[PDB]
Symmetry: C2
Subunit: 368 residues, 2 copies
């Protein structure tokens, strides 16, 4: 039924308090909210939603929602980034399935030991001591502990303690044996660069200083650079804009995204001072501003200062290109990648190798 | 040298502005900060830090830091959770290596197209149109574009556009063929439960209602339950505390962590209204409070309301147990896990099966 909301929530939750939220909703909008707590709602939902019925909103712990999403029974949820930042990131992770958010997280639950302060002022720290405690309580006509033995949720914490688990999780990883430096897409893009060189649209010996000087003197119409370069263009005569990289074969250019980072030397005798400087001086609105006014940093990691920068169209363009690209890996094999690709590009642009032979050699260097 | 800070940062960054931050540091603390920008600092650092020298702090894009961390050259950084929440989560991800944070993220960089508004008011959207643009500019003694061709950072966005990549990333995944329901640790914990039953410390037919009534009437000293149960104990005569689950064989009990979640039915004709209710009524301080006063939610996903709850020792204990446990998977196979483990526990506790035969059968159900 359109124009109202039906909600299902389990009978052990605060469904009367939720109903009070629904009354405020109606009072503000006229839309009636009905809260129900059917038994076995988590089993009924897939059966009724598959026929296009059921409630508008279903509450359960997240463990049930991947099965619902796999069957197409859930709408993708569409919160903007402002709303997403209101909730803890790990709670969104709990409701992501196949890369999409498929629920709103509400609350984080875990079992605890609940004890009667007047019967056991000092509750047992070990399971093994509970039988002796029970013996003393049984002479008083009491028992040490009772909990639900019918639902495995309640017995699982004991089963997992010494090593039981449900499914093993394999952390995300880069496959270092698998590299895309000599595939057809890489060759196509490098061939286009070499064809511009052959056509004398560019020169293979152009380096950072040559390109910067040419652009900042008004000799070339465009350049490719990062935020650190903007300060020198500000001081030049050139009125410049910052925008998306050109597309190739209709697809976006994909710049590697770098996070400028400050590491503390493991040999440093000043680790406490380094922490203080970085946390309490550099990573402040005022600290980042002092660096940024020298040479722009780009988008910054500090949420409070980034909010002040996001307005700048140069920063907007930086983040647009960043979102089309990829974060760099931090793995040790990244330097091998860069050394090999550097040689391949210089060899191909200078005619020391074909594009194919250059990128094949780079691929062999990186993976063998 | 102890009692001062030496910083290395690349020569294209704002090292004079960083030096100004270091002057404010000295003025406040008397500790001198020296900022250097050596050439090839990213290659020199591993050579000098391996001998126990080098700078206290090194700046570079994060791609270099996994190699440093792999060689033991970086201190693990130790920000508390308050500081971590000041920076964007994906920037911390960039400086995590083998599960540890090994740098402070500062700024997010990507290349952009920089254009001269007075030479190309409408900059080209495609690479392919740049040669024709260059031809017209060359008759004016100008060129269309110049950028650094010596460093692969600048040519990679074009190489990646049609399909080039560095290393393929494999997303984290649960291995559904690999289940820990019948390993030695699971059997040990379930055997201890069965031994308590045999010893008449517990009864195999105890369910949720029986245990709740017994605890809330003062007949048993302890129970195991979640936040939703606290409201009924508040109303009872019992003075209760909430604490860590007991250990087993010296290891923590590991409760599964559930995120109470609200999904929107894909068949709902009211998806816009559902979004409004959940985002703007339920997921507010006032909305969660109305539910929480009925039956406590536990820790909540909404950062602003959770800050008000974290003070409660019951919530502290909830999160302590949660951190010792595991987040539930959301995969479709989770319901099979629960149905099979439910049968195993009830069969073993009732004597319908041995612990070994029960858990073996559950393992077979879940994985075949
Ligand atoms: O007729 C035979 C049988 O019926 C009855 O048992 C059945 C249940 O009525 C029925 O709900 C179903 O239970 C399944 C459930 O469908 C399944 O999802 C899974 O449940 C998990 C939760 O998914 C998980 O979130 C967690 O639940 C917590 C919850 O997070 C928390 O917020 C609070 O609500 O406590 C919950 C635990 O009670 O863990 C549970 C697992 O414990 O597994 C359930 C099975 O255990 O199927 C039941 C069996 O058919 C009768 O009770 C039974 O006597 C009859 O034999
Ligand atoms: O003597 C032979 C050779 O010497 C010179 O080239 C060498 C360089 O001096 C040297 O620095 C080294 O360069 C490597 C570098 O060590 C390696 O880490 C990798 O560099 C990556 C960055 O790691 C990555 O962050 C990104 O760098 C951006 C950076 O994020 C950004 O903030 C800004 O600073 O621009 C940087 C790009 O310039 O990408 C670079 C890769 O481009 O790979 C480098 C190699 O390309 O080794 C050089 C070669 O030995 C001379 O220049 C050369 O002519 C001589 O032949």
């Amino acid at each position: 039924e359109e124009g109202k909301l039906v909600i299902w929530i389990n009978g052990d939750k605060g469904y009367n308090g939720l109903a009070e939220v629904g009354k405020k909703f109606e009072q503000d909008t006229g839309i009636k909210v009905t809260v129900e707590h059917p038994d076995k709602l988590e089993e009924k939902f897939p059966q009724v939603a598959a026929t296009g019925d059921g409630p508008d909103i279903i509450f359960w712990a997240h463990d049930r929602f991947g099965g619902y999403a796999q069957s197409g029974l859930l709408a993708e949820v569409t919160p903007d980034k402002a709303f997403q930042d209101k909730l803890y990131p790990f709670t969104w992770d709990a409701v992501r399935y196949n890369g999409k958010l498929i629920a709103y997280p509400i609350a984080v639950e875990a079992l605890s030991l609940i004890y009667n302060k007047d019967l056991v002022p000092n509750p047992p720290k070990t399971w093994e001591e509970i039988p002796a405690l029970d013996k003393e309580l049984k002479v008083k006509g009491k028992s040490a502990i009772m909990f639900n033995l019918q639902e495995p949720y309640f017995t699982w914490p004991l089963i997992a303690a010494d090593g039981g688990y449900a499914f093993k999780f394999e952390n995300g990883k880069y496959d270092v044996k698998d590299v895309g430096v000599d595939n057809a897409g890489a060759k196509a893009g490098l061939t286009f660069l070499i064809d511009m060189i052959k056509n004398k649209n560019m020169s293979a010996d152009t380096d950072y200083s040559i390109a910067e000087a040419a652009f900042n003197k008004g000799e070339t119409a465009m350049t490719i650079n990062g935020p650190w370069a903007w300060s020198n263009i500000d001081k030049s005569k050139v009125n410049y804009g910052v925008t998306l990289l050109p597309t190739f074969k209709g697809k976006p250019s994909k710049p590697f995204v770098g996070v400028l980072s400050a590491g503390i030397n493991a040999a440093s005798p000043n680790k406490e001072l380094a922490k203080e400087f970085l946390e309490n001086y550099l990573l402040t609105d005022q600290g980042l501003e002092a660096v940024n006014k020298d040479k722009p940093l780009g988008a910054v990691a500090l949420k409070s200062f980034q909010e002040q920068l996001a307005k700048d169209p140069r920063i907007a363009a930086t983040m647009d290109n960043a979102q089309k690209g990829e974060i760099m890996p931090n793995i040790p094999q990244m330097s091998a990648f860069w050394y090999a690709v550097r040689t391949a590009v210089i060899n191909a642009a200078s005619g020391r190798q074909t594009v194919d032979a250059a990128l094949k050699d780079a691929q062999s260097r990186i993976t063998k």
